[PDB]
Amino acid sequence: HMAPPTLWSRVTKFGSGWGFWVSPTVFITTTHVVPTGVKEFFGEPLSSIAIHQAGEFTQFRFSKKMRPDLTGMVLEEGCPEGTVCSVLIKRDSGELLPLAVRMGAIASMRIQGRLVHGQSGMLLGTIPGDCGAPYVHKRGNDWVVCGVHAAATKSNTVVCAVQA
Ligand SMILES: [Cl-]
Numbered sequence: 001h002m003a004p005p006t007l008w009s010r011v012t013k014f015g016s017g018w019g020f021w022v023s024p025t026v027f028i029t030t031t032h033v034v035p036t037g038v039k040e041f042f043g044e045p046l047s048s049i050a051i052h053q054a055g056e057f058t059q060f061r062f063s064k065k066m067r068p069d070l071t072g073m074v075l076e077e078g079c080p081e082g083t084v085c086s087v088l089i090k091r092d093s094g095e096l097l098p099l100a101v102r103m104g105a106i107a108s109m110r111i112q113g114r115l116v117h118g119q120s121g122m123l124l125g126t127i128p129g130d131c132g133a134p135y136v137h138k139r140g141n142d143w144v145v146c147g148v149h150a151a152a153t154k155s156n157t158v159v160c161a162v163q164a
């Protein structure tokens, strides 16, 4: 299934990587790309944002509609093993590099000392800078997002962080 422009428009440069607008108020990203010590995100004070971070998965819920042009999509905790997702990688150049990935198992893993609650997959390459890119798949009418890019083997195996 081919990701349409509006879906790409959700993928947003953020910190040392990317994040993704799940809806007008909900933004997801990979914890380690998130800027630390700041007092606002997208011009909104922390106080106005509900933040939950665990297992390298970060979710922001804003009090205000930040992307009022968007519809809300389904966010799931990973996907069924065997599902082929697309990782919607934007590069700093502007290039779009959707990568097809056959997903494997969900697991709590230690990767370079960090606890990642995630899902591994095999590419059917990712680089530093790509973390936070969304893993998506289409089910019926609806695109589903089920993780954010977190790691890859040197090899090729990729891992996305998934929500509790
Ligand atoms: Cl775009």
Ligand SMILES: [Cl-]
Binding pocket: 079, 080, 139
């Ligand atoms: Cl499914």
